[PDB]
Nucleic acid binder design. Structure first.
Ligand code: GLC
Ligand code: MG
Lengths: 558, 225, 429, 211
DNA sequence: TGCATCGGCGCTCGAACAGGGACG
DNA sequence: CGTCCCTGTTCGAGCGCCGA
């Protein structure tokens, strides 16, 4: 039957009226087809014939499943959806097997006719009016309207979900020791009761739901591990992600790449370390979808490594509350990062990967932080607890970094795990002006109306240099000057800029960047033995600054 | 201007209870941070924390004794009390109360102390001392210094006051602390006077026992044989 | 139902809608507490279950107050407060006591409860919706909304103000020397009484409030050290400014002179007559950094002089109550943190240095959040307004832990910045 | 239950001297230890609060030093009052606990005990009892040892002892010791020997008598 | 002869925004 | 001072994967 839950009130967006969309004609066959379907639906309470005064309509056509040869009613709710008020979606994240606990007995159920069992707000119904055209030009079509949650309507998910929550609500207050993972119309139920006592509860539940219009068809797994749930197979002590086969196709259009990387990412959750930083860069560059792209071997390497892993069968385990969480990070190919979350050593719970790069110029200490931050949140989400970390960075490296960085930072409890490629700061600016090295007073400039400018140093030892540049800008140049001073220099030097932009990028102890100029500057830094930069308020006259200023403002200033 | 004074029964039947009262002036048990602490010091032994009653009745008891202890107060009268149930001889000690006070995030000490109260646990009944003289025997006096003594045996309770020649002698005197013997007290005093003085000049020992309202004299006549 | 009182209508700033801010993750610990506080708030009918039909949201979390050991629900109503600023600020703004800054001791009472006894304008309710997350997303979110004035919403103190003034008439007339100021869910009480007598008058206020409905949290006072509870009182006198100071080197190399010039230069924007020509001359040609330039007598004349200009608070700085308040924090290292509060740039209204709680645990995040609370408290006390924080941290790092160290009923506005240690315009040695 | 230990319990020094007493904890008490002074009379005062803070009115020659598990009280330069018993109290955790106390004394040239033994008074004997008193007077240092012997045979049944406190003026000690026998057990022997072994004479100072 | 809707995640790209400076 | 110009940050779009 139809549920007796009070209906959730639905409005149209402010100032908007219902959909008045024309119905295209249909084949005499398609029509009579719909006519069957709708009469069944009308007889089942799902829809009801409507009056002439109803001015709305949303298209309806029918199509058949090639395998069944049976037709199905598809209603196109795009305009209603466009006009239907906003909701605050309540499905806040998808559950994960990793967070499940081991339970004595377990059952999974699925509700039948989910949406079609929940009443649609009495007042919103007229908008769902649709027409199934008359065999001909003869009579106005047959008008109908929805009395339940329409398939493909904007509010059916949020509303069925809330509805299901209210329904379970009482049953849960009376059975606080039976976990019920409620995902849309699927129910994972488990408890630590005896197969008997348990079944006597699972029955009690289905009954309660029936009383509410929710049917629990014999498409329920009873004492049936593997339990097929949310895309995984659940076994008593281990769980598996249902088989993941990647399109091993001949050629590769960008779109094919997405379908591959996405599939891989899905795998990153259980298959230890998956690199994708590789073939993913393919998408890069303004490519149109169908357009094929030459599968770089750099990318070929990935796929290779990847597939290799996916070949090896793995699994994960359930979470035991007493034994705290352990998350270990691994450093991968530059940019990439893998991790495994476990409680008992080689028994992983879940495995994932962090590969985003925040900022143009960055560095492995940062990325490691960024990695640890993500893992934390993801844990809070699955276990509501933060984990203990094992990181490839010695307490020492960290001590220096966080202690000297001007930004505040931290990492929750952890310990160093010796297992390279370890993370370490590659170079280090000096704290004091080193004596026994020149002092290259760098600088640079450019003209906004020409795209070109000069940029070079003027050391204390009367020395000069002034390379000309086109397609740059103060920032580019003042950053360029500092580059020269790093080549035209011994393994010890004092540099001096007037630019915070430049100084800032450097101090961050970057060890990778988006622009070469800086990758090359990082290169020069990891190569010295004593670099030291000091800053000076450009345009004031300070020491060897006027020098380089006029020297570079040559044909831009006075 | 802060003072504390312990009061109690001084002598208590075993298994019975006693109630000590600390009367203080100069501060209030109402002022946040303040509290009164009870300390104990058995005869000859060191300090022992008993309990602390705080301005917010969030009292603390010494584990070993929480069972027979109860701290309390009458804020309006600046008094604090310590009840002790079923006392045993081991409870015989001096009991102090001390103003204790939390002043900063770090400072918490027992700022001022009282002089104590002597609680004695004994089923003994008040008994006056038996006084016996002490005069050397076989080793008759020589032209040097002689040492006469006095023995105050089996009395209860304390104290006894021993002086020589009604206060006249006080230089070579030594009155030793008493000891328990069959739940009774026994102590001696010794005097060392030049031989040219005794027996040529009487040397008597005066023993006073407040509790029994007695006073006795013992002339130290030289041992005849 | 709670009060026969007629609800005062509130309307969002024209052209702005209600908050549609998403609910962030929550540790089991907080959810459990959040669930319990909400279930019971529901029974007593202060909030009401609601579903997807309500398109608004504000996030919620809870903090276990070190204050009283009892959990405290916290709804981050910053969006909503911003979207309804004409109501609680211009129209029914609660006046500020100049004198509150001047007391020797000032205690804070959490009087949120007072709010649960006033109906919230029936229409305005949809805007206070919030959702409760579930570990591992075992179920959808549980939503609610308020019927009584919510805690943490700037509207409440504004509305409840008539009732509050009434409630305090007694106590305030029998203590014409104590100062009381209401800022959101708190009551700032300040006296010049000896601490012990202060600590008492507070309990007395706590009483008067009780003899009137208002309950206020029981603060713990442990007997074992540290006697943290000794900090409860605020002392607006140990509240001093941190001026900028020019070093004092024995001999000044090039390097030093340079740095002394940048800073003295920077400072020139704050203070009037900071002159640097005379002193830069000493660095007149392309010299090597380590060269011990001997200080001129012409120069020295001013180094040791500008510093005389650097000993008195930026002159000509007015506090316009009509404007905002910004605060910047610089991680000076060694658990050190400095801060400036201004409305306009370089016209600071206050500069100071939050030292460091011994319970810093070598956790910058923890210390910053503590610094942000400290400075916020100072702001409320001094001007009765919360500053917007330019925070020296990475947004996504701060957002992962700040709640773990938060211990306040309010939440100030904040943004993130990444400005390197240009010049220690604000530091020492 | 944090046991507090002051190892040195009895300590002799001299006016002018600088002294240091040890107080160690069973576990880091984070400088939540106080120092108490207890004069020979028994009145107890507070010297230092919080490892090393000088309680008001306390002479500026007292210093608290210490941390974690180990702490030390340091009396600048001894005056005659200072010669007292000292206590350390810990307040990191209840139950509050005190050290064992360190008695600070006065160094004096050594001195042998002036032994004297006494027959059982006539009166005591008349009643039916017999105590044999033996005084060990004004000797130094405190550590002395007595030994009874009857007709050469050593006896320990009936011997009660009493030690005095360092005398205030002459800085010495004294000791009573009383062997209590029955009137007949006394009259059932002849030799009564009191033997004092003191760190002065490698030979025990003896004194005896024969009823 | 549409295969919707809602949610979470990954990847990229490209608005929109917020300082520091530079020209006028 | 009013523009503009140059970055670096953030966040949503548009695809894909997975769930019902
Ligand atoms: O009031 C100042 C000081 O007075 C006393 O000496 C207290 O023992 C101490 O804790 C307090 O800090
Ligand atoms: Mg420049």
């Amino acid at each position: 039957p139809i549920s007796p839950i009070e209906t959730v009130p639905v409005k149209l967006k402010p100032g908007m009226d219902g959909p008045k969309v024309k119905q295209w004609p249909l084949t005499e066959e398609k029509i009579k087809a719909l006519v069957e379907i709708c009469t069944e639906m009308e007889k089942e309470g799902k829809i009801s014939k409507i009056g002439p005064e109803n001015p709305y309509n949303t298209p309806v056509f029918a199509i058949k499943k090639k395998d069944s040869t049976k037709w199905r009613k598809l209603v196109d709710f795009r305009e209603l959806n466009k006009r239907t008020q906003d909701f605050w979606e309540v499905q806040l994240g998808i559950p994960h097997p990793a967070g499940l606990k081991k339970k004595k007995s377990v059952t999974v159920l699925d509700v039948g006719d989910a949406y079609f069992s929940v009443p649609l707000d009495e007042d919103f119904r007229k908008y769902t009016a649709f027409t199934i055209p008359s065999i001909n030009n003869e009579t106005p079509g047959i008008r109908y309207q929805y009395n339940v949650l329409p398939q493909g309507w904007k509010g059916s998910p949020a509303i069925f979900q809330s509805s299901m929550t209210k329904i379970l609500e009482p049953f849960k207050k009376q059975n606080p020791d039976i976990v019920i993972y409620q995902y849309m119309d699927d129910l994972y139920v488990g408890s630590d009761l005896e197969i008997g006592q348990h079944r006597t509860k699972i029955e009690e539940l289905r009954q309660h739901l029936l009383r509410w219009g929710l049917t629990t068809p014999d498409k329920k797994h009873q004492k049936e591990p593997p339990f097929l749930w949310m895309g995984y197979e659940l076994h008593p002590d281990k769980w598996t992600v249902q088989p993941i086969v990647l399109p091993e196709k001949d050629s590769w259009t960008v779109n094919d790449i997405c379908k591959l990387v996405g599939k891989l990412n899905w795998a990153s959750q259980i298959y230890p370390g998956i690199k994708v930083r590789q073939l993913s860069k393919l998408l890069r560059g303004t490519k149109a979808l169908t357009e094929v792209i030459p599968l770089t071997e750099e990318a070929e390497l990935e796929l290779a490594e990847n597939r290799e892993i996916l070949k090896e069968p793995v699994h994960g385990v359930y979470y035991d509350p007493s034994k705290d969480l352990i998350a270990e990070i691994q450093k991968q190919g530059q940019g990439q990062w893998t991790y495994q979350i476990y409680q008992e050593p080689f028994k992983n719970l879940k495995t994932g990967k962090y590969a985003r790069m925040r900022g143009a110029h960055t560095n492995d200490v940062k990325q490691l932080t960024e990695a640890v931050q993500k893992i934390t949140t993801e844990s809070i989400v699955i276990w509501g607890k933060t984990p203990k970390f094992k990181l490839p960075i010695q307490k020492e490296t960290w001590e220096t970094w966080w202690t000297e960085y001007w930004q505040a930072t931290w990492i929750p409890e952890w310990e160093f795990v010796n297992t390279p490629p370890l993370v370490k700061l590659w170079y280090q600016l000096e704290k004091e002006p080193i004596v026994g090295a020149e002092t290259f007073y760098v600088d640079g400039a450019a003209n906004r109306e020409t795209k070109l400018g000069k940029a070079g140093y003027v050391t204390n030892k009367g020395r000069q240099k002034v390379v000309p540049l086109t397609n740059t800008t103060n920032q580019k140049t003042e950053l360029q000057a500092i580059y020269l001073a790093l080549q035209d220099s011994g393994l010890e030097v004092n540099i001096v800029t007037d630019s915070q932009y430049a100084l800032g990028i450097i101090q961050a102890q970057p060890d990778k960047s988006e622009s070469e100029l800086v990758n090359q500057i990082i290169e020069q830094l990891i190569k010295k033995e004593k670099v030291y930069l000091a800053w000076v308020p450009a345009h004031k006259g300070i020491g060897g600054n006027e020098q380089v200023d006029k020297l570079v403002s040559a044909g831009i200033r006075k | 201007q802060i003072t504390l004074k312990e009061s109690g029964p001084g002598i208590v039947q075993p298994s019975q209870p006693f109630r000590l009262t600390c009367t203080f002036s100069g501060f209030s048990l109402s002022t946040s941070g303040i509290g009164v602490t009870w300390i104990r010091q058995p005869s000859g032994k060191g300090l022992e924390w008993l309990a602390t009653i705080w301005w917010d009745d969030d009292n603390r008891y010494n584990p070993s004794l929480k069972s027979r202890l109860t701290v309390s107060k009458d804020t309006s009268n600046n008094q604090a009390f310590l009840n002790m149930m079923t006392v045993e001889t081991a409870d015989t000690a001096i009991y102090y109360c001390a103003q204790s006070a939390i002043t900063s995030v770090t400072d918490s000490a027992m700022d001022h102390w009282g002089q104590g109260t002597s609680v004695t646990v004994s089923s003994a009944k008040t008994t006056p001392p038996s006084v016996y003289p002490l005069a050397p025997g076989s080793a008759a006096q020589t032209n040097s210094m002689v040492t006469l003594g006095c023995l105050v045996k089996g009395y209860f309770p304390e104290p006894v006051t021993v002086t020589w020649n009604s206060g006249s002698l006080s230089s070579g005197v030594h009155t030793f602390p008493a000891v328990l013997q069959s739940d009774l007290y026994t102590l001696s005093s010794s005097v060392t006077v030049p031989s040219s003085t005794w027996p040529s000049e009487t040397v008597t020992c005066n023993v006073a026992h407040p509790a029994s309202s007695t006073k006795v004299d013992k002339k130290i006549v030289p041992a005849d044989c | 139902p709670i009060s026969p009182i007629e609800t005062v209508p509130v309307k969002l700033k024209p052209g702005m809608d209600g908050p549609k801010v998403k609910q962030w993750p929550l540790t089991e610990e907080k959810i459990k507490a959040l669930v319990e506080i909400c279930t019971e708030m529901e029974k007593e009918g202060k909030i009401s279950k609601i579903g997807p039909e309500n398109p608004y949201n504000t996030p919620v979390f809870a903090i276990k107050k070190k204050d009283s050991t009892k959990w405290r629900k916290l709804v981050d109503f910053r969006e909503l407060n911003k979207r309804t600023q004409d109501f609680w600020e211009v129209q029914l703004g609660i006046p500020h006591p100049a004198g509150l800054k001047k007391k020797k001791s000032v205690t804070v009472l959490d009087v949120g409860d007072a709010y649960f006894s006033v109906p919230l304008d029936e229409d305005f309710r949809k805007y206070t919706a919030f959702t409760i997350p579930s570990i591992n997303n075992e179920t959808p979110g549980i939503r609610y909304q308020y019927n009584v004035l919510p805690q943490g919403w700037k509207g409440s103190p504004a509305i409840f103000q008539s009732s509050m003034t009434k409630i305090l008439e007694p106590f305030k007339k029998q203590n014409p020397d104590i100062v009381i100021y209401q800022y959101m869910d708190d009551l700032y009480v300040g006296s010049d009484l000896e601490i012990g007598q202060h600590r008492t008058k507070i309990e007395e206020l706590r009483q008067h409030l009780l003899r009137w409905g208002l309950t206020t949290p029981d603060k713990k006072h442990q007997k074992e050290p540290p006697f943290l509870w000794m900090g409860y009182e605020l002392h607006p006198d140990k509240w001093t400014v941190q001026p900028i100071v020019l070093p004092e080197k024995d001999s000044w190399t090039v390097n030093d002179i340079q740095k002394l010039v940048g800073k003295l230069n920077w400072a020139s924007q704050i203070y009037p007559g900071i002159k640097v020509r005379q002193l830069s001359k000493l660095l007149r040609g392309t010299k090597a950094l380590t060269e011990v330039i001997p200080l001129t007598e012409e120069a020295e004349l001013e180094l040791a002089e500008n510093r005389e200009i650097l000993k008195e608070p930026v002159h000509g700085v007015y506090y316009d109550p009509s404007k905002d308040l910004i605060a910047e924090i610089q991680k000076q290292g060694q658990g050190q943190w400095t801060y400036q509060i201004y409305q306009e740039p370089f016209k600071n209204l206050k500069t100071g240095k939050y030292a460091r709680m011994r319970g810093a645990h070598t956790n910058d995040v923890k210390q910053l959040t503590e610094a942000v609370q400290k400075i916020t408290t100072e702001s409320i006390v001094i001007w009765g307004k919360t500053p917007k924080f330019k925070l020296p941290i990475q947004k996504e790092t701060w957002e992962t832990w700040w709640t773990e160290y938060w211990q306040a009923t309010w939440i100030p506005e904040w943004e993130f910045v990444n400005t390197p240690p240009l010049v220690k315009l604000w530091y020492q040695l | 239950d944090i046991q507090m230990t002051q190892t040195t319990s009895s300590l002799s020094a001299s006016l002018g001297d600088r002294v240091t007493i040890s107080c160690s904890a069973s576990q880091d008490i984070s400088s939540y230890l106080n120092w108490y002074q207890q004069k020979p009379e028994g009145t107890v005062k507070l010297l230092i609060y919080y490892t090393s803070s000088l309680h008001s009115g306390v002479p500026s020659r007292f210093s608290g030093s210490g941390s974690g598990t180990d702490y030390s009280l340091t009396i600048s330069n001894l005056e005659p009052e200072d010669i007292a018993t000292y206590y350390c109290q810990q307040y990191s955790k209840f139950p509050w606990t005190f050290g064992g106390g360190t008695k600070l004394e006065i160094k004096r040239a050594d001195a042998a005990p002036t032994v004297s033994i006494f027959p059982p008074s006539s009166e005591q004997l008349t009643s039916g009892g017999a105590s044999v008193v033996c005084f060990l007077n004004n000797f130094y240092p405190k550590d002395i040892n007595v030994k009874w012997k009857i007709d050469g045979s050593e006896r320990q049944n009936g011997v009660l002892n009493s030690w005095t406190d360092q005398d205030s003026k002459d800085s010495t000690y004294s000791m009573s010791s009383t062997l209590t026998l029955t009137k007949d057990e006394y009259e059932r022997h002849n030799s009564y020997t009191c033997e004092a072994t003191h760190k002065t004479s490698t030979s025990p100072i003896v004194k005896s008598f024969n009823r």
